[PDB]
Structure formats: structure tokens, C-alpha cells
């Protein structure tokens, strides 16, 4: 997250860190959202490489013991049937990970609230992006979970020429674009939390930024619109 601030430990309890095994250690690659005790939602581009993955829930500082972490293996990956690695701009950047065990819920580990199917946010709706990604374009990962206020930019403005044009589809949410705050590499797969009827719900899965940089004026961070995939999510949970 570029232009963020450090989050409190208990503010975003559905946030997970998706890590892969690197030698004898584990490295953070992507965010995700816990949606059932044994299911995580993330971006399909995060699991394109056939690596050994684990999920950490109750995480706050990547590099030091918080006393709240639970570490569980990924047992099954289900990416959307229409995902194409060679075209993230086509959409369908979403995958569901079945965990090897059920995690225990407590004040650090809670399920993410999903929107109702078809829900579209009005322009400039208040949302927060959270993650441990790069704090600058071509920078380094955050040690502690970061958050930034990222108001939505509706489809009509975001698909205009001055912004993303044709690259953004209606199956996506755009948020930010002020040149200061944005998602950045390592935030992918994580939540865009938006306040709807007094409740924060996860309306976006972070998908991409400009190849020119993370915080680029009129290139908002783009998210998979979760409310476009509610039937698919439920059909995968109910059969696996």
C-alpha cells in the first residue's frame, strides 16, 4: 500500500497473508480474505506459479511474533474457469483456497462479510485497502499491515479515456487514483473493505495497477468485483 498508515491489530481480522516456501523460509506474496473457517478468497494471478503455499491468519507484523498467528497449509486451489494469465484485463481474477484445517476464530481471526450479488457502489464510496505490499513503486514490502482510504471511482469514469479506458470492465471495481495512495505489488488478492449499511464488507479482490507505477494519477487500483462472483463462490464452497 502506497501512502498508507499502519492498521491496528484487530481492525481487519479477515485479512490473511498468502506465503510460499522459499528455501527454508516462507515469503509473503499476496493478500487474501478468510471467508469460511477453511476457505480463503484471493486473486487467481497469485497462484499461477505452482509453488508450495500456506496461509497465515491473525497476522500483523510479518517479521516478528505477534502471539496471534495460526499457520495452515493450502490443500486445494480452485481458480475461476475463465481466468487467463495472459489477459488480467479480461477479468476473472479470483481463486478460492481450501485450507488443510479449519482455523479458530477469535478477535484477530474473523470471516469477511461478502456483498449481496449484483451490488454496485455509487461513485466515491468510502473504502479502505489493506495489505503488506510495497509502500512505494519499486520499494519494499511493509512489515506491518497498512491501510489507505481509497474511495471508489465508478465504471463510467474509470472506463473513460483519461483513466483506464477499455482495460477496465464492469466485473471490476476501481478505487483511488489520486497519485498519492494506492495498492502496490504484494497487496494483490487482498480486500477492498467498503462501509455499506453500517457494516464493512469485502467488495474487491486487489488485481492490478499501472505498469508505470502503483500511485499514478488517474490510474486507480483495480479490483475484481466480488459481487459479480457470489454464485460461483457459493457453488464451489457447497461442492468441495
CA distance 185 to 138: 9
Q: Establish whether 93 is a catalytic residue.
A: yes
Find cell 473504502 and name the residue. 127
Among 66, 119, 143, 171, binds Ca ion (CB under 5 A): 66
Interacting partner of 183 out of Ca ion, ligand 0Z1, none (Cβ under 5 to 8 A depending on kind): ligand 0Z1
Distance of CA 23 to the CA centre of its chain: 26
Residue 188 among the catalytic residues = yes
7 binds ligand 0Z1 (CB under 6 A): no
Task: Say whether residue 233 binds ligand 0Z1 (CB under 6 A).
Answer: no
Quote the least distance from Cβ 65 to Ca ion, whole Å: 6
Nearest-approach distance from CB 85 to ligand 0Z1, in angstroms: 6
Q: How far is the CB of 96 from Ca ion (least distance, A)?
A: 25
Which span (66-74, 94-102, 204-212, 227-235) binds ligand 0Z1, by CB under 6 A? 204-212
Which residue out of 14, 182, 188, 227 is catalytically annotated? 188
Task: Give pairs for 106-110: CB < 8 Å, separation 24+.
Answer: 106/58, 106/68, 107/10, 107/13, 108/9, 108/10, 108/13, 108/57, 108/58, 108/60, 108/68, 109/13, 109/34, 109/57, 109/58, 109/68, 109/70, 110/13, 110/14, 110/34
Binder among 39, 132, 208, 229 for ligand 0Z1 (CB under 6 A): 208
CA separation for the pair 77, 53 (Å, rounded): 10
Annotated binding site: 59, 61, 64, 69
Q: Which residues are part of the catalytic machinery?
A: 45, 93, 188
Residues that bind Ca ion (CB under 5 A): 61, 66
Amino acid at each position: 500500500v502506497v501512502g498508507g498508515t499502519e492498521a491496528q491489530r484487530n481492525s481487519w481480522p479477515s485479512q490473511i497473508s498468502l506465503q510460499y516456501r522459499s528455501g527454508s523460509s516462507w515469503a509473503h506474496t499476496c493478500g487474501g480474505t478468510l471467508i469460511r473457517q477453511n476457505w480463503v478468497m484471493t486473486a487467481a494471478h497469485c497462484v499461477d506459479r505452482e509453488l508450495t503455499f500456506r496461509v497465515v491468519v491473525g497476522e500483523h507484523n510479518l517479521n516478528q511474533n505477534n502471539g496471534t498467528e495460526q499457520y495452515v497449509g493450502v490443500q486445494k486451489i480452485v481458480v475461476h474457469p475463465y481466468w487467463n494469465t495472459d489477459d488480467v484485463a479480461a477479468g476473472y481474477d479470483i481463486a478460492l483456497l481450501r485450507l488443510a484445517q479449519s482455523v479458530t476464530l477469535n478477535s484477530y481471526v474473523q470471516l469477511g462479510v461478502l456483498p449481496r450479488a449484483g451490488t454496485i457502489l455509487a461513485n466515491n464510496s468510502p473504502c479502505y485497502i489493506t495489505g503488506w505490499g510495497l509502500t512505494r513503486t519499486n520499494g519494499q514490502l511493509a512489515q506491518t499491515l497498512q491501510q489507505a482510504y481509497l474511495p471508489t471511482v465508478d465504471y463510467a469514469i474509470c472506463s473513460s479515456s483519461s483513466y483506464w479506458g477499455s482495460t477496465v470492465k464492469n466485473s471490476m471495481v476501481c478505487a483511488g487514483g489520486d497519485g498519492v495512495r494506492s495498492g502496490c505489488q504484494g497487496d494483490s488478492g487482498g480486500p477492498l473493505h467498503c462501509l455499506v449499511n453500517g457494516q464493512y464488507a469485502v467488495h474487491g479482490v486487489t488485481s492490478f495497477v499501472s505498469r508505470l507505477g502503483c500511485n499514478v494519477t488517474r490510474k486507480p487500483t483495480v479490483f475484481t468485483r466480488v459481487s459479480a462472483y457470489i454464485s460461483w463462490i457459493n457453488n464451489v464452497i457447497a461442492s468441495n
